[PDB]
Amino acid sequence: QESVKEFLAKAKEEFLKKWESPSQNTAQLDHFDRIKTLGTFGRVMLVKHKETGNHYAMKILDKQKVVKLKQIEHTLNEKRILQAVNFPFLVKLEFSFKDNSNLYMVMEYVPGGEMFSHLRRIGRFSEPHARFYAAQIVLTFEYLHSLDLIYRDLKPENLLIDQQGYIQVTDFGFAKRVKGRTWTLCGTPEYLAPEIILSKGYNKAVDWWALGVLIYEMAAGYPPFFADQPIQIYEKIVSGKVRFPSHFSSDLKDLLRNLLQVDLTKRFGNLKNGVNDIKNHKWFATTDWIAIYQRKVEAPFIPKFKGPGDTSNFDDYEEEEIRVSINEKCGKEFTEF
């Protein structure tokens, strides 16, 4: 308890220091060469710093589209959080800046690809392999929640696999500092907790629900609630019924029934013992939490890539201009970025 307590207290101290005085305008666009679009309010591009030669993933957001999609506060949230957190399984923000048209967040490039692609290629992960990844998310959420941060977009698409086979969580677009509840409708349909769908004020229990969805999808190859159209998914989510493939262990089913509890007041991670109801569950009996945190556990696989500039594990997107207008757009809205 004291080892963890003092760790988290220091982690919060250091977060709050950066949080109170965010960094701003720490590079500019022409410091980088554009290489390739890695994903698509904006997109993520692989770039190369012209002086150091280091590769980064540059998230580019169109200010005007951010305004129209009502994402102003969310983009400010994302940048402020990324520049203030520090944890082994969180993508590292190196620079941020803005110009007349766009907002830029420049992160260390993780060349191994998204867990999503690997999971669809292999079909499903074994339970040990799912558990290895799950354990990192548990520790990451323990860290974030102790900072009064909610994440709100857990899914394999946002979990990058790094050079050692470990996770780096990316995309903090929906993350937010919350000491009580919050109300915004956001997330991804298959991963939305019932109380989000039902337009309630909700809290960090939604991250533990999403972990339930993630573990199920990793171990089954399919998420627990799916349908042709999102509206049909939502009805399944709120129904309170989930079926498990027969190959799931009894321990896994028991953990998932407790994470995928529709009643947020009964959901693991949100009970009196918090995250320890999850960490102490039989399904994690073999998990060495410290060895995971120290990255001393052999990973299920090391992604195949040729070097720090290799884009092989990402797919191919239409290569569009980075348009920068001659006139400043939305200056007042993003003064603080």
Binding site: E114, F116, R120, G123, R124, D153, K155, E157, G173, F174, C186, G187, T188, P189, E190, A220, G221, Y222, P223, F226, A227, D228, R243, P245
Partner: peptide, 16 residues
């Protein structure tokens, strides 16, 4: 179950 997931079509990257 897994075949029904494939049948949904929603096996690609999911947007927010």
């Amino acid at each position: 179950t897994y075949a029904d997931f494939i049948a949904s079509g929603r096996t690609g990257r999911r947007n927010a």
